[PDB]
Every structure is written in structure tokens, then in C-alpha cells.
Amino acid sequence: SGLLINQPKYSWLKELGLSEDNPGVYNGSWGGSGEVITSYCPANNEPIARVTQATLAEYEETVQKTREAWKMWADIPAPKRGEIVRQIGDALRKKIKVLGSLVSLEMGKIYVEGVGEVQEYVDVCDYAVGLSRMIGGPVLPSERPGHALIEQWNPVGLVGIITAFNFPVAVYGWNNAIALTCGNVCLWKGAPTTPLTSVAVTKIVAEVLEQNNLPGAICSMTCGGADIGTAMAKDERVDLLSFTGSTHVGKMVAMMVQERFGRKLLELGGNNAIIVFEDADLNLVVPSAVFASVGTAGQRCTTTRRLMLHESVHDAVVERIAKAYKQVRIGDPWDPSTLYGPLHTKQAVDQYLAAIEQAKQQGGTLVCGGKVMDRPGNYVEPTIITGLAHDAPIVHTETFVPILYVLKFKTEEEAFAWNNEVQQGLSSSIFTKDLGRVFRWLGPKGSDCGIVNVNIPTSGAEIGGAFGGEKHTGGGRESGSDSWKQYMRRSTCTINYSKDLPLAQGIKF
Amino acid sequence: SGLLINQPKYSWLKELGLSEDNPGVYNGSWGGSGEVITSYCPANNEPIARVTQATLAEYEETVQKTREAWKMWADIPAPKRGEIVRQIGDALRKKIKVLGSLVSLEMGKIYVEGVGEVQEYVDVCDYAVGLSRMIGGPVLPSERPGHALIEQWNPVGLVGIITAFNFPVAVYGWNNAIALTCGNVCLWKGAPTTPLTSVAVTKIVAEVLEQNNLPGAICSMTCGGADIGTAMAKDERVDLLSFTGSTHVGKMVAMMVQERFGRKLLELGGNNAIIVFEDADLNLVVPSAVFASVGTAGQRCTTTRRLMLHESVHDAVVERIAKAYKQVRIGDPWDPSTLYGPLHTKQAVDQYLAAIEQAKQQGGTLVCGGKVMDRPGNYVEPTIITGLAHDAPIVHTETFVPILYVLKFKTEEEAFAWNNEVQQGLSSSIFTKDLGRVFRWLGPKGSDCGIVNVNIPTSGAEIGGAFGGEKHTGGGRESGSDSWKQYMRRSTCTINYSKDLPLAQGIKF
Amino acid sequence: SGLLINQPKYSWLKELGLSEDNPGVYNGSWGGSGEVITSYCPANNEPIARVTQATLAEYEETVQKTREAWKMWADIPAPKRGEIVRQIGDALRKKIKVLGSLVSLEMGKIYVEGVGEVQEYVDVCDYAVGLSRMIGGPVLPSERPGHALIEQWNPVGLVGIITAFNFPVAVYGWNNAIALTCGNVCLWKGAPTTPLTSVAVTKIVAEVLEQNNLPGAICSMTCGGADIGTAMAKDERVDLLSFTGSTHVGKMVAMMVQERFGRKLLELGGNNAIIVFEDADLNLVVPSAVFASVGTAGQRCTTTRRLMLHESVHDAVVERIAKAYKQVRIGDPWDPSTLYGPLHTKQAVDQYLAAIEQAKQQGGTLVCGGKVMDRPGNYVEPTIITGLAHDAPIVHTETFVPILYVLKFKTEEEAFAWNNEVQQGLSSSIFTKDLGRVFRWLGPKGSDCGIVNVNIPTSGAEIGGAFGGEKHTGGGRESGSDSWKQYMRRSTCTINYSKDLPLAQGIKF
Amino acid sequence: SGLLINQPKYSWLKELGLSEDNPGVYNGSWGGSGEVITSYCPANNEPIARVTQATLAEYEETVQKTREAWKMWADIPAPKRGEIVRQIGDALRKKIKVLGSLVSLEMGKIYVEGVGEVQEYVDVCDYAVGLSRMIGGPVLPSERPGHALIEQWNPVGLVGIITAFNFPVAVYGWNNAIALTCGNVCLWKGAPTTPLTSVAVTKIVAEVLEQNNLPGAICSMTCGGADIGTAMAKDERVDLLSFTGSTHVGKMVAMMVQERFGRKLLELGGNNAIIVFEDADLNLVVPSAVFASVGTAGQRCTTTRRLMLHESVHDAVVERIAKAYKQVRIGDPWDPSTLYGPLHTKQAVDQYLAAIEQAKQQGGTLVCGGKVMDRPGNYVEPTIITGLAHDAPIVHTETFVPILYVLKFKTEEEAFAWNNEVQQGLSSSIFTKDLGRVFRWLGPKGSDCGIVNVNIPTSGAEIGGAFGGEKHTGGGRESGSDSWKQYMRRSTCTINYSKDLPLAQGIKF
């Protein structure tokens, strides 16, 4: 019976500036006349509302308006750009509950995590305000008398941002706050299945830009599929392409960007491992493992996919994790009791079922889960599988679903090697009390991941540090440390200010 | 007339450990059984000596010996690796004259510049010794009580280095010193036309490694053509590929490395512009322009290719540069009088003649030069061409030859735009006395190059700063600032050291 | 005619939580039973309201409560402390107008500048939020195998802050935001003549701390004179004393802190010089000079005291500045476009008159001003004096009053030397178009000040950079760059995590 | 019989350029006509040779020559200054054995440690070479359009260096290498009892300066007592005074420098504690404790003075350390068998005997040692004392002698507090396997020292990190991290390069 938005139960969606049909293009003015997409709530498969995506011609026009906006934007001092970013942070803060609710409704993650995602954007904005007075390179001492030597950083220009479904607000945010602070203009193509969240966020940002008499095209949005995404990847006018998504798609995009010598920031797949040693605090391990695997229905890029247990504690730990799995409250994402919601799409359910099959075929035993739940929505049981070899093809594959593969190990050398043997390289954790092991894990013969944690799971990450992975995860970094450098171009500048002339070396002038 | 090396006039070549035939593979032991190449002296087209290049199977075996060497090398503390780099610096210092002489003989650049190139390696070694006690990331304050947060840097593993002909010692050096300091092992494939220099350098480095009882494979070398170069680009065991060469070849290599998610450092073509404004010190401009254009026979990646003169000074400056060109002493590279030697190959001579032709077809007038010199060796006249449009196809192309294209401009906006309009983005210079112009040139609406100079030519660059370009020049950086980061992998590490347990949130454990 | 606060025209003072009598001590609870001081409005010499200052015993008790608060505060992660600092920023933002108005009423500076001062605190808070995720030292590579080497930064403990009258909000703010972010607790003794501003600020901060269930003693205040100030200087429990004030008082305090090996941050006197060269843009010079000299009635520590004019432009510039001085409209602190108010106290008026007489006795000629204005308040005429020798005793003295001493120079060497010859070393400016001169001025044979400006006056300074002087100005730095390090203690930490034992060297164990 | 230098067994002293009488002043030329001091070998109380110290008038003249040398030296680019530092490093390297031998002969430490000290100078030189291309501040983004903002670092001028007896080469070296790299000139007053080492070093440095046609006054030396030292402390021409010595003398010097607003670097006393917890590796603890206490005859500023043992391991550990003490080979410093030489002076022996007395009076029991050894030289037995209270006056005092006070503790809180309770704050160590304890020790409620070590003793320190202490140790830092900043002055520079004029705000110009 109709779109959710038309029902009174859902009229809070109107506070986000959303309607039955929504324009999917913003570039200072709203529009869009491409394919009309209908966004479904994964909790009950009911349609929420529609978004009209961009045509290539509308993308084309958006890039021109963006390029033009950059001209005036790049001329605004960085601390003054930070003032804009600060206000974006505040505008978001005001709408945190309803925006969090939309994320929960459209993506499927629990309400508190929807709110948490909005907070990530808010917090990275405040961080960026700090950076706006800091970004730059060293003044260096030249070897030449009467010469100044400085390292300059400047905006790359336009930052294209392609994001994944699972974090429809935060990923954009992490990129937006930094890119803006760095004097760039953004163009955003969110995941096709979360266009309402894209529009809602763009609405909040657009209003701030407009309050401040700035061209709206500084933060443009064009919703669409591979369609538009490919155009961005091939577009010479896109100075930096930030891609967050599958490692399969990322590769296609990377190759296209490389082809035209563009800059890229790649945030791709993970196959994240928790390694539990004999001396680990098991009272810490068990809840850590559960929440890291089960959270967001196994749909964070940082979700634990591989749990390696030392032979001495293997059977005891598995059983305890299994006892916890039984108490994982599955239900409506809006319900404060719910810890675990639906998978994002029906295709996701199919991957889940297929991965279950392959696991069995490869010698896996199901400890629990494995079945599609008999109810509205894309609900599947959180699954634990023991018995597979460390290099079973399915274990080496990222399947974006709540399945946890349990591995049994003996030596430290083994576990470390198995952690590293896969093609992904996002996140990693060991649980241990051993001082030497901690630093070995952190050193050159330890983990090969971008995130390397000790006694905290694979999803433990904060704004202050650089976020991203290695190998097939793509190399890119977001948010903390000197991540900003990816959004700017370095120039090594020598200024001769002396009256000294170069040696004539035999020639008369 | 035989090989030069057999003649007494050239027995100093034996001090570099060189013989009639030379092994082109080193990996802890010397060998090679691939194609035998004969290295010619471009000053007289006489054969110097031969080098036996690697077979794929010998490359293959070198990669395994390299990987094995890394194991022990990565375990050596960075300051202690720096001690090795220090000694390489000193070993080079002892052989500076003869090695400089070999560069001059085999590449074709003047003796003093051959010596200067060796000095670059020496100086970057001493710089690396400093870095060996410095490399690393920040300790960061975690938002979580009882949690440490640190940024760790670790060796990427094996660094493949492919170098160009024009700087056969320095480019390898810049990479070697840094990579070694950073706990990596190197594999070097030098330009096919400079294998004797490759071998000579490798010999010097090998001896130091051996004096210190270190596996020689830490600094491996396999000489060869596209053959081996492609193998490296495709090899998953090469953790970072550093490529210095043409932007055409770089692309092929880049695409191959991207395909397999490897790390790349790209140091490609340039189309470097000097912009002379009305208020410029012409007594500084004239000698600067001459030496920057004519030096190394127009064969530095940083060589001035485009000289933009303000209409008010155009005709006066061109004429003065032309008067200087007449006094450029052309001769034997070994001869201390010579300022200008031969082009590196005969093919180079053909590019030169072809570019002359295209320049004429596109409306160019030859101010001077343009003719192959009637004498032994690959000698061509240093050429100046006026009258071409800023966007004449030939002007936008890097031709690695001593031709200088002269452009006439009026507005600052014009000159800046023309500097940026090309696909290359290595080096750039303006000559002016205007305070505001200087900073605009350095800012966001100024030069888009990696090197952005004021009142010093396009080849003004020192160790202390990052070296490299933007756009089609490839993005890579060498030597100074935080260039070292490209040779290492970042990991964001969170250590939970507290006894705190995570909230149970309704679940009983 | 009673207290101003009791009159309806001034009831906005009640919005700041102010009353007829006000407690001058806060340490989690309010009080004070020392001397009752009456704060006068320097615009009309009318009493505003009273503040009860601290007794030594109440200072004593405040230090204990502060030390106790630190225990819990130091345990809170830096980003979480930044969240507190963020809220202080916001709380201030809400009260910006009334607080600015109080500064204007109690100190005497114009309304817009009162508001500007509050903004400084607000902006430094947002800066500190950035720092809260950044502060720390490098992870360093140890020369010892299996050893970690890190630089740790930790709170010094309690930061005592003694501030001057002229910036009663901002100076405290610059210190508060950073110290808090760095895990310190603060104790504030503001200038005796601005206790209402001290209380008002403390009230705003106290409320934020209390909203967040934090001990109020984290930001303690004890109002008083030299009395309390000396106690702080001598108190071993004060880990860092930040002193902003006269260089005469600063010295006494410094000596006392040195005596007990405490840490000190000194922000003392200035004798700031503007040097105008022949090629300067005079249309820029004239307004710059006027506003830098006349602003805040010559009562900024950065105020231009010495204006050095090249002989060629001397008489023309003086006359133009004089024409501008005539249009400097004296009005009332609040008001619309009042550009100039009263001196802070009557004693200030006496210094002004005495400095005038000494100037005359030392050969000075009054171009304008010099007379006490016949009206309510501490109003004096803005004065220009020509003819004095560069080393006339009065010129070398900081008199905190709106007198501008004009010097005539010829050579660059002269001007630079005269700038440096004084004992103060806060701020300095040159106005010129000469590229070489700019960098000479910035280099080792240029200015010896902490602030070294080009084509901007002596009061040009922003949050992003470190603020402070050299020589008799005291060495301290506030706000930007790595100023934070003064508020923390560095520790060089080596962690041995290996099983390696030290060489027995002949001894059996 | 007679001076040692005249005997053939000691003619290697002539290789250092030493003679019977030696000039104690160098400032480009050698001389000195003050008090003639005779330097005695503490191993046999035999006179080595004489040095003629400076008169005040000769100090005075040396300061003028130094100031004059600075003019030309400050004009030399930092990397080119580093080239000088590099050569100093090499000149030292050539003389390492004989210079090490002199340290051993004149100070009394064992030969291998004399050599090690020279190596510290050599290694810090190479470090400084790296820094010579790195030193400087950030380029910062200004909030003002068309304004550049940069942090500049410049030489302070002349660095006065006053050193202690115990490290007569290295302390100077650590200061020399950095100060020179930073464009300062040095004046050195070494300890009165080690003037031959001072002269020998100065000779090596002087030669390098002269080889390079630089004024010798860049590295001046004036030998003398409190006499000259006080003059330096009071001298306004000394821009920075670096003092290494007793905390008693340091205070006098500090107070004098503070009085005249000079810069100071203080490296004073230590009372260094090793804390051994229950879970410590005792096989590591015992040899660590022995060597850290007994090394250099207890005469390093980092020497372990306090050993805190957990009650559970106390009696076992003391006994094991005592068994090791018996095997400590006491003898001639020149003999390769010797691990432990003489105390530096006879007064030192008296302090030792007096501290023994006070320890007994305060309830201490001698485990071993306590007696003057019956032999030539200042030899005393290495002493261990148990039973004293943590706050026994003698334990809180630094006595520069080989006595180790053993404390028994129970709680972690206790040990940490006892470590911090003293007025010194140089070095500290804990021995433990507990992950949480390690980071608590490093954090805000851990050690309050400048050096904070884990599982390595109190003398574990390397070039890469900043070296120095807190509290009564004086705050100064040497060598690593950003220690260099203490040798330079910061300037925050704003450059307005736009044509923009400031708002007229009602005034017509």
C-alpha cells in the first residue's frame, strides 16, 4: 500500500526536505531527468520514495558549474573555508536524529548506528576546522645563498566522490570535510540504493552554502549507477576520484583513472582477521568478536570475517561465541531492543546462501545460522563456520554478509602469515597479553594491513588517524594524520631573491 | 679500432672493475647469459665494451634471492641501515672522478656534470643517514581511555627501479639511498644504452654490502630492455615499482602495476616553461635561459623547452640569447672546455630533425641551429625557434632534444594558462621582481607543476625538497621532504592496554 | 550617583550573571572574602560594580581543589577534553555581544573590538578541538633491535595564568583552550582593574563544566593584586606560570619561578616598529600606520610605538598621518563608529603626560595631540612626535599610551639595526615592494622579533601561528604552531620488548 | 716522576697536538695567560700536562672575535654548514682511538667508554648533516586573502657551552653539531679538571675550520673555573647558555641568565630509579642493574641511584646483584680487562665516604663495598645499601658516586610516587611484562622524567631522541627530535602581497 513517505507514521522524512519524488541532481539548482529509482526499506521491502537520477548531459552540466564554482572557492583562505565546514558540522548536528533515522530506514542498520554515522561527519568537520589553520608543508633551508625554499600545497581542483551503500553519510563526510578544507569542490555520486540519504545530506550542505552566499556547485551531487560512475572515472576534469566500494569495481575505476593520469583514492574490500592467542583475555575476546562480526549485519568494510583461535582455546571460545549469538536480538531497526537488522538487498541474501553452500562444499561445519529467516525484509541468520582450511577459496573471498569463518592455529608465525596471505589488507587484530608479540605484530614482520589493532576488534577506528588499507584494499587514506595531502598537490618552490648572477663560465654577455 | 676499453688511453675504466665483457646480473653473485649489448660512446660512435644482460630466468632467480635477503635486512634497525648507506656514500666519494668520467663517456654529458651526478648520490646518502633516525609517524592521542594510538611505518619489501639513460647514476641513487634507509631491498634495471654505468655503480655498492657481511641481493641489478622492464611491472613480488623515463612508456608500466594493485612511483616527461615578465632582470634571464636550455644537450627532464617572453622584451631577449648560443663551446665531453656534447643516440638525432621539420610546417622560424653537425658523434646544433602558436602540436610535445620554442605573451593570465595547458607538469619558472606575482605563481591560480621556481631556471632543484611532477609527469616524488613515505606502508595502530571490558548491552557472558 | 549596574540602562550586565557585589573566587563553588574592589568605567569614571577578591587562605584552598580536579581530568582522553573546549567555544558564542559590551565598558576599548576579543577565544577553542586529536611526538626508529622508541607528551599539571588589563578575555582564552586540551587544570588571576570581565568569563566556563558533571576547579579563578600573583609565582604546586603583563613585573615573576625550577611562559612588553621604505605603497602605509597606532587608544602590546620613515618620504607621510589623526572620531565605547576611547586608568594619563614632557626635553616636536581632553573619562589626544634621535631614552621605553615616535632613516642597515637595538622584541613591520628586502628582513640579519611582518602593521597576527616575542618580551608563545608544547612535558621513551639479554662481559650470572 | 706526557709510554698524546704546556684559549688564534692548571690522571694521581687558562680579558676578547665570526657564518646556507659538521665528524673519526684514550686517562672512565663518547660526537654530526637540510617551521594558511604566513627559524647568535667533567667530549659535541648546523657560533668552557680533552677536541675542530678558510672563532674555547663560567652566565652577548653540570651550580647560572632575559638550556642532576616488578625477567634485571650502577664508576648523570624491588623478589635480586658485584674487575682504565675505574677526584672520594656515613645514620645496611681501596688512584668499592626509607634524606640527594640505594615496595602506586617524589627528574626505568603497566608508566600518572624506559636501564638513550630531564634537572634537551629549536629563534611572519587596502572606516585619505 503505497510509498512509506505518504503515511503519517513517516512524516518525519519531510523534515529532511524529502518528498514523494526527489531531484537527484544538485549543482546550485535542483533537478534531474534520468532514470527514476525507487528506494526500498530493507526491513520490510516496502518502497520509501523515489529519486530522479542524472542523465549524462546533466552530469556534464554539473561538472562545468562545479569547475566554475572552484574559481571563487579556491580564492577563499583555508581558515575561512573551515568556517564553512564548521557550519556544515552544526547544520548536521541539528538534524542528527532524523538523518540517523533515514540511514536506518534506507540502509538497514540500527538507529543508534545511523546516529553514530552522522556523528562521524560532525566530528570530522570539527577536526577539519583545526586543519584549516594547519595544512601546508615545511619551510626548508636552501643550500643556495639568498634563496628561499618552501613546500607549497594547493587544491587539486574538483574531487569526484563515489561512495558505497553501507555508510551512505560518513564516507561522503570524511571526504567532504577534508576536500572542502583543502580548497577543492566536490561532486558526489552515492550508491544507487541509498539516493534519499544522498539527497538529504546534499540538502543540509546546500542550505549552509546558500546561507553564506556561496555557489552551491561547491558541493554538487549527481545520483546514478555505473553509468555516471564510469563517466567520472574517465573524466579529465575530475582532478581526484575518491572511490569507496567493492574491490572488483574499484579496479575498473582505478584502471580508467590511471589511463588518463588522474589522481585516485581507493577504499576497497576487506577480509579482516581477529587472532586470539593462548594468553588472551577471553572475557574481552568473546564480546569483541560477537559485536565486530554481527554489527551492521556483517556489512562494515571492517567487519571481522576471519576469527583465528589458538588450538588451546578454540573449542571453548567458539562455544561461548555461539551462546552469545543466540541472544543477538533480531528485529526492526527502529526498535531500541534490536541489535541486528536486515541485509541491504535481496542479492545480498543470495550471496549469503551461496557462500554457505561453498563453505559446506569446502569442508565447513555450521556452528549456527545459515538459514534465511521466515519474515518480511532481507533477514538472515548470523552464521559461524568451523573446520575450513586457512586457504579455502571462500575464506579468501570477501562476501559482504554475516558469516564468520573460524580458523584453528598453533604458532604465531602461522597466524601472522594467514592474516597476510589474502589479497585484501584493510583491518586486523590480535588479542594477547604478550608485550613482545604486540610490537612484533606492529613491526615489519607483523600485520600488512592499514589498520593494525591489539585487544580491540577490526572495526576499532577513530577520526584522528588515517583510515584505509593496503594491497587489494587500494592504498587510499581518509580523515586523520596527513590524509589531506591526497586532496592537494605538492610543489617544491625555490625563490631566488638575491642580486647574484650565475657564473658566466667563459661566455661574454 | 676495437673496443675503447682495450686502448691504454682508457685503462682508467679498469679502476671501476670493468672489462671487455661484463656480467649484467648481480644478486649476491655475478653473471648473466642473455643478449650481449655493446655500449657506444655517443661522442665518436666507438664501442666502449660489452655487457651480458639477464634472461627472464635470471631475473626470476634474482627476485627470489632479493626476497630472501629482505628477511634479514628488514630486521636491521634503521639507524644501522643508515650506517650502510653512509658507507655507500663514501665508497662513491672515493671513485667520484672515474665514475663521473664513465657517465660522461657512456651517456655523453660533460665531465663536470658527470661528477655532479655522482655527487647527487653522495649527498642523498648523507641526507638518508639523517632520515634513518627520523622516519616514522606521530603518536596520537586516542579518544578511548587506556588506549594507545600510533602511526607505524614499515618497509614495502622489494623496490624495483627502472631508470632513464640521461641520469644513469643519480636517479638510481635517489631511490637506493631512501629505499635502503626504509628497510627495503632494491632491484635495478638501468637504461639499455648505459649498462656499463649500471655495472660500475652496482660494483661499488656490492663491495660495501660484502665488506659488511650482508647478502648482496639487497641491491640487485638485472640489465635489459622492455623485456625485463615489463616483467617487473607485472611482477606481484615487486612491492613498489619506481619508474623514471618517457611518459609514453611510463603509462604502459603504470597500467600494468595498477592492474595488479602494486605501488608505483612515476617520474615521467616534462615540457618545462620559463616565463619572463617585463620587470625581469634581463642580465639574470639571459644566462639562466641559455644554460637551462643548452645544458646536457637539452637532455634533462627539467630542461627548458618553452621560453615565454613578454612582448615588450621579446625581440631584445631572443637576440641576446642568440648571441650567447654562438659562444656555446661544442666538443668532446671529456674536454674541460666543452659546454655542449652530443645527443645520446642516433635516433635522438632523427627526433631532432623531425621536430625541426614540424616546427617549420607549423609556422616556426629558426633563429639559429637546426642542422646536424658535420663531425664524428651524434652532434646537433642548439636550436631556437620563434613564431609558433602557444598550442602548436610540436610545442605541446616533449622532444628530448636541444630545441627551444619561444612564445610571445602579454597578460599574466595568458602566460600562467599556457604554462598549465600542456599534459606534462614537471618544472616551471617565472622571472619577475613583482612581489604579488611571485605569490600568485606559488598559489592555487599559479603553476600546476611539481617544481615552481622564481628567478631560477627549470633545472634548479636540490636534495632537501621532494622532486617530481604532476599530470602526465606521473605524481611520484624523489629525495627530499617526506618522499620516503612512498617507500613504506602506513599502519594506524590502536593498542588497548586497559582491563576494561566492552558493554554487554543486554547479553549475558 | 550609585553603581552603573543598578541603573536600567545597564541591566544587560545581569545576563552575564553579574550583580552589585560579585564573588571573586571560583573553584567548584563561589566565594571570596578578601579586599572588595570597585571596578570603574574609564569612559566616565563611574563605578560599575564590586568584586570580592581572594584571601591568601582562599587562594591556598583553591590550589588544593585544583590539584584534586586534575586527577580525574588528566584521565580523560584529549579528544574528549576537546569536546569540552568546543562547548566553551559555543557558550561564549551565545554571549558574544554582552561579553564584548562588558569588555568595552570595563576596559575601555571600542565595542567592535570587545566583540573581536571574544571571537579570539571562540576561534582558538575550535583550533584546540583540532589539536585534541593531534598533540603528541614522533614514533622514532631505535638503533637497538627489538626496541621501540617514542616521544610522549603529558600534562604539566596546574597552569597558573596571570593576565593584563588590555585583553581581559582573549589572553586567558588563548591559554585556557590550549592548557585544557593538553590535560591541564587552570587557575586564573586577572588584572585587578578588570575583575568583572574575569568573573563573567569564569561564569560562562563554570556552567559548561557543570553541565558536563566535571569538577569546576578545572578552571579556577582567584581575583587579586600582586598579593596573589606573587603567591602563584612562588608556589611549587603551580607547574606552569603563564604571565602576560609589563616587562618590569614579568621579570620579578620570572626570577621567582626560576628560583623554584618551575616552568614559565612570558608574554611581556613591546616597542613595536613600522619601517617605511622609499618604494612602499604610501596609500597602504598611511591607513595601516594610523589604525595600528591609534587602535585601542595605543594600549595593545602590539601597538606601533616607533614609525621609521625613509628621508625621501618622511615629511609627506607624517603630514598625511596627521591629516588622518584629525578625523579620528572620539566617541563612547558602545556607540556606532567610535574609533577611539579612553586610556584605561588615571595613572595611564599621568604616564602619557610625563612621556610628552620627556619627549620635549629630549628634542622632540609635537606634530599633534599632547593634551588631556577636557571631558569625563580618561581621554587623551593621540600624539605624534618627530625629531627624536633613534636612541632617545623615551623612544627605547614602552609607555603604554597613544604616542607615536617618528624616526627618519636613510639606509636599510640603519632601520634594521634601530628596530633591533631596543630591549623589547615583540612585533615588527616593514613596508616595501623590494623582493630581496622582504627575505633579508625575514632572515638572520633582519628583524629579531617574534612577529616579523611585511606590508601589514605590527598588530597583524592570527590564531594559526605562534604568538610572542624575544629578548625582554620574554620568549613565551601562545595559540598557534607547536605552542602547546609549553603546556606539556616531553618524555623520550625506550621500550625493550625483546627476550635479548645484555652481554655478560666476563661476569657469570 | 715528572709529567706523564714527557714519558715515551705516553707519546701518543702528541698525536692530539698536546705538549707539556698547552694554550687554553682558542678564537682563531691560540693563547691564554691566566692560571696554569695541572691535569691529573685519577688512576694514579700522576700529573699528565698543563693548560694555561683564560683571563677575563682573554674571555672578553674571545667574545668579540666570536660575534664577528658569526656575521659571515650566519650567511652560509644550512646545508653548507652541515658540510662543515660532516667534516668535523670525519676528523674525529680519524682520531677516535687516541682521543678516547685521552678521555680515559684524564677523566678516568674505561677505554671502550672513552671511544664510545667520541662516537657519540661522530654520530650526532651525521645526524646534524640530515638536519641541515630540514630545520625550519611550517608554511601556514593565512585567514587573510592574498597574505602568506610562514614560520621562520634563525640562529640565536652565540651559544655559550659550559660542560661537566664526566663526559668531556660528548656533551660539547651534542651542542656543537646542532648549534653549528643552526648557524650559531660556539664558545666552550669545559670542566676545569679536563682541560686537555677540551684542547684536544678544539684542536681537531679548529683544523677543519681552517682547512675550509673559516674564522676559527666559530668554535671558540676558553678554559677556566667558576670565574669564566659566571662571566658567560652574566654576558648579554651570550645569546644562549647551555649548561651541563650539578643542579646546585645550574641554579646560580640559571638565575643569572634569567636576570638578563637570556636563553638557557639546562642539563642538571639526576636521581635515577629502576623499578623491578614481580613479573620482571630477573635474568635481564640483574645484569642491567649492575652495569647501570657500576658503569663509569657511578659517574653518569643517568646512573641508577635508586633500585626499587618488589617485596616478593627483593632478597633474591639483591643477593644476585651482590654476587655480580664481586666479579666487577677494578683496575687501570687503560687495561681492556677493567670494567670499573677510579672516581674522578679526591673530593669525590670524600663525598662517597660521607654518603656512606649518612646512610648508616639513616638506618642503612651495607650489603657490600663502602671502603676506599688501598691502592694508587681515587679507587673506591662499588656499594649497595638496603634498608633505607624511600624518603631518607641521603636517598633524595644526588651523590655522584658508586652507591646504590635499594628500596622495597609493594604497590605500583607506591613505586611510581617514590620515583616522582624527588626533586630530580632525568631518567627512569621499570622492568615488567605487564602491557597495561607499561603504558600507565608512559602516560600522565606514570613517570615524571625526561627519559622513561621499559626493560632497559636508566642509561639507555640514543641520538634520535631528545635528551634531558624535568623538575630540578632543568628542562633543557639535547640532540634528537626537535631539540634544535632551542638553538634558534622562532618568528611568525605574515606577508601581504596583495594590492588590497584596509577599510577606511569613515576617514578620507
* A74 Cβ contact partners less than 8 Å away, ≥ 6 residues apart: A155, A183, B444, B445
Q: Which of D152, D126, D138, D183 is nearest to D487 (CA)?
A: D183
**D126/B464 CB distance under 8 A:** no
Which residue among A447, A465, A494 places its CB closest to the CB of B151?
A: A465
Q: Which of D203, D219, D192, D188 is nearest to D85 (CA)?
A: D219
* CATH code of the domain covering residue D387: 3.40.309.10
Is residue B129 within 8 A of residue D126, CB to CB? The reply is yes
Verify that B444 and B338 share a domain, yes or no.
yes
CA distance A415 to A436: 15
Place of cell 581581559: C168
Binding site: which residues of D?
Answer: 163, 165, 189, 230, 246, 267-268, 398
Write the single-letter amino acid at A82: G
Is residue C290 within 8 A of residue C397, CB to CB? The reply is no
* B69 Cβ contact partners less than 8 Å away, ≥ 6 residues apart: B28, B185, B214, B215, B216, B217, B218
Query: Alpha helix (H) ranges present in B212-345?
Result: 226-234, 247-259, 282-294, 314-325
**A126/C131 CB distance under 8 A:** no
* The one catalytic residue among C58, C106, C267, C381: C267
* Triad D163, D169, D173: Cα angle to 5°: 85
Cell (9 digits) for D436: 597495561
Is residue A440 within 8 A of residue A434, CB to CB? The reply is no
Verify that B150 and B250 share a domain, yes or no.
yes
Verify that D484 and D427 share a domain, yes or no.
no
CA distances in angstroms from A453 to A275, A413, A422, C445, listed in the order given: 10, 17, 18, 50
Place of cell 551462546: A323
* The one catalytic residue among A267, A381, A412, A478: A267
Verify that D366 and D484 share a domain, yes or no.
no
* A172 Cβ contact partners less than 8 Å away, ≥ 6 residues apart: A121, A161, A163, A188, A190, A198, A201
- In chain A, count H helices and then E strands: 14, 22
CA distances in angstroms from B304 to B70, B289, B297, B301, listed in the order given: 41, 7, 11, 9
Residue A410 distance to chain B (closest CA, Å): 22
Nearest residue on chain A to B494, judged by CA atoms?
A453
Cell (9 digits) for A268: 576497497
Phi, psi of C444 (to 5 degrees): -65, -20
Write the single-letter amino acid at B346: K
Contacts of A84 in chain D (CB under 8 A): none
CA distance A377 to A18: 23
Phi, psi of D207 (to 5 degrees): -60, -45
Is residue B158 within 8 A of residue A478, CB to CB? The reply is no
Q: Which residues sit opposite D479 in a β-bridge?
A: D466
Q: Which of B432, B401, B377, B409 is nearest to B293 (CA)?
A: B401
Q: Which of D210, D205, D250 is nearest to D91 (CA)?
A: D205
**C433/B435 CB distance under 8 A:** yes
Check whether C230 is labelled as a binding-site residue: yes
CA distance A112 to A338: 10
The SS3 of residue B451 is strand
Check whether A14 is labelled as a binding-site residue: no
Which residue among C138, C141, C450 places its CB closest to the CB of D490?
A: C450
The SS3 of residue A491 is strand
User: How many CB atoms lie under 10 A from the CB of residue D462?
Assistant: 22
Is residue C140 within 8 A of residue C495, CB to CB? The reply is no
Place of cell 631522541: D465
Verify that D7 and D71 share a domain, yes or no.
yes
- Please confirm, yes or no, whether A267 is among the known catalytic residues: yes
CA distance D426 to D457: 13
Domain count for chain D: 2
Verify that C233 and C360 share a domain, yes or no.
no
Check whether A189 is labelled as a binding-site residue: yes
Check whether C282 is labelled as a binding-site residue: no
Verify that C219 and C318 share a domain, yes or no.
no
**B133/D134 CB distance under 8 A:** no
CA distance D429 to C27: 36
Is residue B3 within 8 A of residue B47, CB to CB? The reply is yes
From the candidates A442, A497, A500, which should be mutated to test the interface with C, based on the most C CB atoms within 10 A? A497
Kindly write down the DSSP assignment for every residue of C113-152, as one continuous string: HHHHHHHHHHHHHHHHHHHTTT---BEE--SSTTEEEEEE
Resolution in angstrom units: 2.8
Residue at a domain's end among C462, C480, C495: C462
Verify that D452 and D502 share a domain, yes or no.
no
Verify that A211 and A303 share a domain, yes or no.
no
D363 exposed, middle or buried (CB, 10 Å; 0-12, 13-18, 19+)?
exposed
CA distance C3 to C10: 10
From the candidates A126, A131, A434, which should be mutated to test the interface with C, based on the most C CB atoms within 10 A? A126
CA distance B355 to B349: 10
Check whether C408 is labelled as a binding-site residue: no
Verify that A136 and A255 share a domain, yes or no.
yes
Q: Which residues sit opposite B185 in a β-bridge?
A: B158
Helix (H) or strand (E) holding A35: none
**B154/A444 CB distance under 8 A:** yes
Nearest residue on chain A to B443, judged by CA atoms?
A154
Nearest residue on chain A to D150, judged by CA atoms?
A139
Contacts across the C-D interface (CB distance below 8 Å): 236
Phi, psi of A354 (to 5 degrees): -70, -40
Cell (9 digits) for B114: 658527470
Which residue among B136, B140, B438 places its CB closest to the CB of C141?
A: B136
User: How many CB atoms lie under 10 A from the CB of residue C327?
Assistant: 13
Helix (H) or strand (E) holding A240: strand A240-244
CA distances in angstroms from D72 to D68, D81, D185, listed in the order given: 8, 12, 10
Domain containing residue D225: 1-269+463-509
Task: Taking the CA atoms of A458, A459, A461 and A466 in sequence, report the sign of the dihedral they define.
Answer: positive
Q: Which residues sit opposite A431 in a β-bridge?
A: A276
**C495/A439 CB distance under 8 A:** yes
**A438/D435 CB distance under 8 A:** yes
**Residues of D identified as active-site:** 267
SS (H, E, C) C427-454: EEEEECCCHHHHHHHHCCCCCCCCEEEE
Contacts of D127 in chain B (CB under 8 A): 129-130, 133
Contacts of A480 in chain C (CB under 8 A): 133
Which residue among C133, C134, C148 places its CB closest to the CB of A439?
A: C148
* C315 Cβ contact partners less than 8 Å away, ≥ 6 residues apart: none
CA distance C25 to C161: 14
Cell (9 digits) for C131: 589539536
Write the single-letter amino acid at C131: L
Q: Which of A219, A202, A245, A174 is nearest to A69 (CA)?
A: A219
User: How many CB atoms lie under 10 A from the CB of residue C393?
Assistant: 12
Verify that B182 and B309 share a domain, yes or no.
no
Phi, psi of C290 (to 5 degrees): -60, -60
Which residue among B144, B261, B448 places its CB closest to the CB of A472?
A: B261
**B439/D133 CB distance under 8 A:** no
* CATH code of the domain covering residue C55: 3.40.605.10
Verify that D473 and D448 share a domain, yes or no.
no
